[PDB]
Design a protein around this ligand. Structure first.
Ligand SMILES: [Zn+2]
Ligand SMILES: [Zn+2]
Lengths: 877, 290
């Protein structure tokens, strides 16, 4: 055997104290006495995540390897190497992969210099990933083991994995585990002959390992280097113990880095006045930034502001101390708090908003044009457009109705109600209306904010990581005046349009689904779309603008001005952390969907209906090619619409972007050409993989609900909504931020503790949890607060009388599908959701979990209710 | 100064040990909930392709990650406990080494015995906590479990430290002297009774098993103990007054005069919490005169 084997055997034959003292016998260390506790406090700059950053700095400083262009990282883990590389000058993009899981290193987020170029991926195995184009490859995978043969096998496997990715002109820095046996030297010789390099040891590396690294800009011999390293290791344990040479840690600073590519052009003639006014308002601190991280948006400037927002969110204390056994479920605690600091907003904006789509072809354009024209002619058969006034808006604002996301212009007034009565507000509104009537806009800007930036929260909060657009009050009033009739007249009701479900309560969609599933055809398909709000192109906006053909006069002029100057020409402010403090930038864009909530809902419903109709057109085989549409097809496609067009719209149900379709023939799943061409890419499925259908209507997900069916004691049959109990409990423990008191939080708790008694009465673990809240609140208080479900325009559980009469009125008297009208007079005749199904849906009954759901029951809940304090109440259980 | 430092140390150790107990309990409840959830998922027996199945498996992985985070959090706190605890014993060691120097050259023992009893209680409760932690984690031990070696190394270290402490925990309070003439100590006379007193620094003893102490002595003038060399201490005696041993009637008989000395040896068998250790100690040299 070689000298390395002797050294390994000698190190194996050693004592514990001798082994501990042998580790530091001349090596160099870095003082981590600051960075660790800085990271623990929550710092996100001027720090190094791990120790490999110093080693990589040592390698780069002596230009042993010079990364450039795109850099691929294997087994990054926390990602010290990738984070250090991102701050370099010649690096344009960093991509890294690691294998996560139990007992493995995981990436954590930092905001160091150039943090907007680094993307890390987790839970991917490198051995089963096809190679891609790369310019510099880094590999630092290796695990020690007492046996030499297993280490040699691991090294050979690593080399076999790595040999495929390398090209002729790619830089590399690869770690080799055990280099002192011929079983690796024979391969190393061929590899060095083919590609070049050498084996060099890092002085920072510990004294307990024989590690070596393979680099690019070096040369020499392998066996001689290994022998000399072994000789040095042998000689090492012969001198005295020398103190470790301490070296200060690396500091990286903070900021954002720009790549330098732009793919957008501005229209100065439309937004010049707005830009000039905004610049003139803040002339004192106006400056140009050269490090804007925007690629598909324009840039104009930046000024100074004060930081707003805070990580995490307030927690409703009234609902807490009642749901005691739920403090240990990871889902409840994780989704409870989100991030809305400028760092989180920048992260969301980089991750989702900044994208780019592609233009469709001629045939799809003609198809959607024809379909949109026919649909607009069909809907407006029994309705006429009109114009809104000021009294209706005043009544809307006075009643605290479901207004959209809007800031109340806090600089001068304090709330919308306080500003409505004033006259200066109306004077400004009139001036802006006069300006808009001549095809100019001057005070129409937006605001942006982010939310939902945790790991498990996005899987249980509708669609997470969203972005809401605020607007000034005057623009809101102008938009309402222009296009209020689409919602004030119920254009998208089920009676008028045979597909929409607007105006229908949450307790009625199950009946609609059951009625739909009674037809003849194939199976039910419930595919969805990811990021629907960002997949809208200019062509769709132009198609939706075709509603003005039914208008006239001043109404038509105002609608045209609103459509042209606002919806497809936007100006948006956003915040961004900088070393000098906090700043606000202004950007612009043509595409995408930004408007009020109700208008967005209506337009999305219309576009979804048109897209579903086009896909059903393609499924039936009316037309064959989408690249170009010819004659004898336009006539054929128009005949299909006239003949059975109305009936085919009755097979669907489209609330927002959620759709359910029952086609005549199962050829629906194989028609994925027009849908992919338009830009509505599906979610979590392969691009060309056929979709999966359902043969049962009790499992189809619609509006994040699965609809069961129940049987009363008498024999009557109902249909009830359902959901995962964990999500409801997690939502129920979050205060929206309208508290800072006990009365407010108690009112909110009582307000949305009645939704469970109304809709989710069929499950054991939720009906009981509402009686405690009703018996703890002192009653006599109005439970007025917006809870959730802004789309559902019922909000019926806000009343004050006893819930039994309300239940009897809602589920019996006003039920079209219920024949008999004999009411009930007790809470004991209402049945439950079985026993096993309750556990499956997420309850805590029937098994060992009943042993911990044994103190949150009437056995030990009376003390919990009394724990509230001097605040009186009234028993109800 | 040293005593106040010891009191502050033991107070902070008790506080963080209570915190560790709370963390252990919380981990136990979380593990129980995860086990129940996996059981109910498995008994469902629904193999198919569904988003709900894809949803539940993702949240199952997150639960496993949290279990590892909690499990790894226990060890370092226990490891940090051992390091700080190891400082107290080596600091308290010279307090006993200098204690015997004065005897060879007020003689209260309350502070030392209280400190030793507190340390023994801490060690025993830590050992029991590690044992129950191992018993809990043996149920769902799986791949990549650092506990499967960490808990064993921790028990080994705890046992070694306890053995080292109990090796020095035995001291002789009083040398054998005659009650008639206490003026001359450490002197022996043939055919006479002698009074000795030995105390053990830890005031811990099982309430159902009595404690047994034996004695032994040493052509030199070999002497044999004519009287009984064995005695038994009632378990309630340790609670009433402490582990006090009194042999007030021991006699020695014979089977220049002052050229070599004789040494009396003390041996105790300690049994508590399933651990048995053998201890031997020696008294001050004495000379026998006829
Ligand atoms: Zn305007
Ligand atoms: Zn269910």
């Amino acid at each position: 055997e070689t000298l390395g084997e002797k050294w390994k055997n000698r190190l194996n034959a050693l004592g514990k104290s001798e082994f501990q003292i042998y580790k530091k016998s001349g090596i160099q260390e870095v003082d981590r006495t600051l960075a660790k506790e800085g990271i623990k406090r929550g710092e996100t700059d001027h720090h190094a995540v791990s120790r490999g950053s110093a080693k990589l700095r040592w390698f780069v400083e002596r230009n042993l390897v010079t990364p450039e262009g795109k850099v691929v990282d294997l087994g990054c883990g926390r990602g010290g190497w990738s984070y250090y590389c991102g701050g370099l000058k010649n690096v344009k993009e960093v991509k890294g992969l690691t294998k996560g899981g139990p007992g493995h290193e995981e990436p954590i987020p930092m905001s160091t210099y150039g943090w907007n170029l680094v993307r890390l991926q987790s839970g991917v195995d490198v051995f089963f990933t096809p190679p891609e184009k790369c310019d510099t490859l880094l590999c630092d995978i290796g695990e020690s083991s007492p046996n030499p043969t297993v280490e040699a096998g691991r090294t050979l496997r690593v080399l076999n994995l790595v040999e495929n990715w390398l090209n002729n002109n790619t830089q590399f820095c690869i770690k080799v585990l055990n280099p002192y046996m011929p079983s690796v030297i024979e391969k190393m010789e061929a590899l060095q002959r083919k590609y070049g390099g050498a084996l060099v040891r890092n002085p920072l590396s510990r004294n307990s390992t024989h590690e070596m690294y393979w680099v690019s800009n070096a040369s020499g011999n392998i066996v001689s280097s290994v022998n000399m390293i072994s000789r040095m290791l042998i000689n090492r344990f012969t001198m005295r113990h020398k103190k470790a040479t301490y070296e200060p840690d690396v500091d990286l600073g903070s900021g954002t880095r720009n790549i330098g590519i732009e793919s957008e052009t501005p229209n100065l003639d439309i937004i010049g006045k707005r830009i000039e006014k905004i610049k003139q308002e803040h002339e004192t601190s106006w400056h140009y930034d050269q490090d804007h991280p925007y690629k598909t948006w324009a840039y104009h400037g930046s000024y100074e502001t004060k930081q707003t927002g805070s990580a995490s969110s307030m927690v409703n204390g009234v609902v807490r101390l009642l749901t005691k056994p739920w403090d240990i479920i990871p889902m409840v605690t994780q989704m409870a708090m989100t991030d809305t600091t400028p760092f989180g907003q920048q992260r969301v904006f980089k991750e989702k908003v900044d994208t780019r789509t592609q233009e469709p072809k001629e045939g799809t354009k003609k198809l959607m044009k024809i379909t949109a024209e026919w649909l607009w002619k069909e809907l407006g058969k029994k309705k006429t457009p009109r114009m809104c006034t000021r009294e209706e808006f005043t009544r809307k604002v006075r009643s605290n109705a479901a207004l959209g996301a809007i800031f109340t212009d806090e600089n001068k007034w304090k709330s919308a109600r306080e500003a409505v009565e004033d006259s200066g507000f109306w004077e400004l509104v009139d001036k802006e209306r006069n300006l808009h009537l001549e095809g100019k806009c001057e005070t129409c800007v937006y605001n942006m904010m982010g939310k939902r930036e945790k790991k498990l929260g996005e899987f249980g909060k509708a669609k997470g990581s969203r972005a809401i657009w605020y607007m000034w009050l005057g623009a809101r009033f102008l938009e309402f005046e222009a296009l209020g009739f689409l919602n004030e007249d119920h254009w998208f009701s089920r009676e008028n349009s045979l597909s929409g479900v607007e105006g229908e309560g949450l307790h009625k969609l199950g009946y609609i689904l059951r009625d739909v599933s009674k037809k003849e055809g194939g199976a039910m398909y419930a595919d969805d779309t990811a990021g629907w709000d960002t997949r809208i192109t200019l062509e769709d906006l132009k198609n939706e603008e075709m509603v003005t053909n039914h208008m006239e006069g001043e109404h038509k002029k105002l609608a045209e001005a609103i459509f042209k100057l606002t919806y497809q020409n936007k100006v948006v402010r956003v915040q961004r952390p900088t070393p000098r403090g906090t700043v606000m930038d202004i950007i612009s864009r043509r595409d995408q969907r930004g408007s009020g909530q109700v208008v967005t809902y209506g337009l999305n419903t219309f576009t979804n209906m048109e897209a579903q109709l086009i896909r059903q057109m393609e499924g039936e085989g009316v037309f064959k090619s989408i690249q170009h549409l010819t004659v004898t097809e336009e006539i054929a496609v128009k005949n299909w619409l006239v003949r059975v067009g109305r009936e085919r719209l009755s097979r669907m149900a489209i609330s927002g972007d959620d759709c359910v379709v029952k086609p005549l023939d199962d050829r629906f799943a194989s028609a994925l050409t027009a849908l992919n061409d338009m830009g509505k890419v599906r979610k979590d499925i392969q691009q060309w993989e056929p979709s999966r259908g359902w043969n049962d209507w009790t499992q189809v997900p619609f509006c994040s609900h699965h609809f069961h069916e129940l049987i009363m004691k008498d024999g009557r049959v109902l249909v009830v909504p359902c959901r995962n109990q964990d999500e409801l409990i997690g939502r129920a423990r979050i205060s929206q931020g309208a508290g800072w008191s006990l009365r407010e939080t108690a009112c909110l708790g009582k307000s949305y503790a009645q939704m469970w008694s109304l809709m989710y009465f069929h499950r054991r673990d939720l009906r009981l949890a509402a009686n405690a809240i009703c018996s703890a609140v002192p009653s006599h208080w109005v439970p007025t607060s917006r809870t959730t479900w802004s789309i559902h325009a019922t909000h019926e559980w806000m009343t004050t009388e006893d819930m039994l009469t309300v239940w009897n009125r809602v589920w019996i008297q006003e039920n079209p599908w219920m024949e008999d009208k004999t009411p009930v007079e007790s809470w004991e005749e209402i049945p439950y959701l079985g026993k096993r199904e309750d556990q499956w849906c997420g309850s805590l009954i029937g098994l060992t979990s009943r042993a911990t759901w044994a103190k949150n029951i009437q056995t030990a809940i009376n003390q919990v209710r009394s724990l509230i304090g001097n605040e009186e109440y009234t028993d109800y259980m | 100064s040293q005593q106040h430092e010891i009191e502050s140390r033991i107070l902070d150790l008790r506080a963080m040990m209570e915190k560790l107990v709370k963390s252990i309990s919380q981990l136990k409840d979380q593990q129980d909930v995860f086990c129940f959830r996996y059981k109910i998922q498995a008994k469902g027996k629904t193999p198919s392709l569904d988003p709900h199945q894809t949803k539940e498996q993702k949240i199952l992985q997150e639960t496993l990650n949290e279990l590892d985070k909690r499990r790894k959090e226990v060890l370092d706190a226990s490891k940090a406990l051992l390091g700080r605890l190891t400082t107290l014993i080596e600091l308290l060691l010279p307090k006993l080494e200098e204690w015997k120097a004065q005897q060879q050259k007020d003689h209260g023992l309350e502070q030392l015995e209280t400190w030793f009893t507190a340390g023994a209680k801490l060690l025993f409760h830590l050992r029991q906590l590690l044992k129950e932690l191992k018993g809990l984690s043996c149920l769902v031990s799986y791949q990549d479990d650092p506990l499967t070696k960490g808990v064993d190394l921790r028990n080994a270290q705890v046992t070694e430290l306890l053995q080292r402490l109990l090796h020095r925990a035995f001291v002789v309070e009083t040398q054998p002297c005659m009650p008639q003439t206490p003026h001359r100590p450490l002197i022996l006379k043939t055919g006479s009774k002698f009074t000795v007193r030995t105390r053990l620094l830890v005031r811990l003893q099982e309430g159902n098993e009595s404690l047994t102490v034996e004695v032994s002595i040493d052509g030199f003038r070999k002497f044999n103990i004519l009287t009984s060399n064995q005695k038994t201490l009632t378990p309630e005696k340790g609670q009433s007054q402490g582990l006090i041993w009194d042999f007030g009637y021991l006699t020695l008989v014979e089977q220049g005069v002052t050229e070599e000395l004789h040494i009396i040896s003390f041996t105790v068998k300690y049994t508590y919490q399933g651990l048995k250790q053998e201890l031997k100690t020696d008294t001050l040299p004495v000379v026998i005169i006829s």
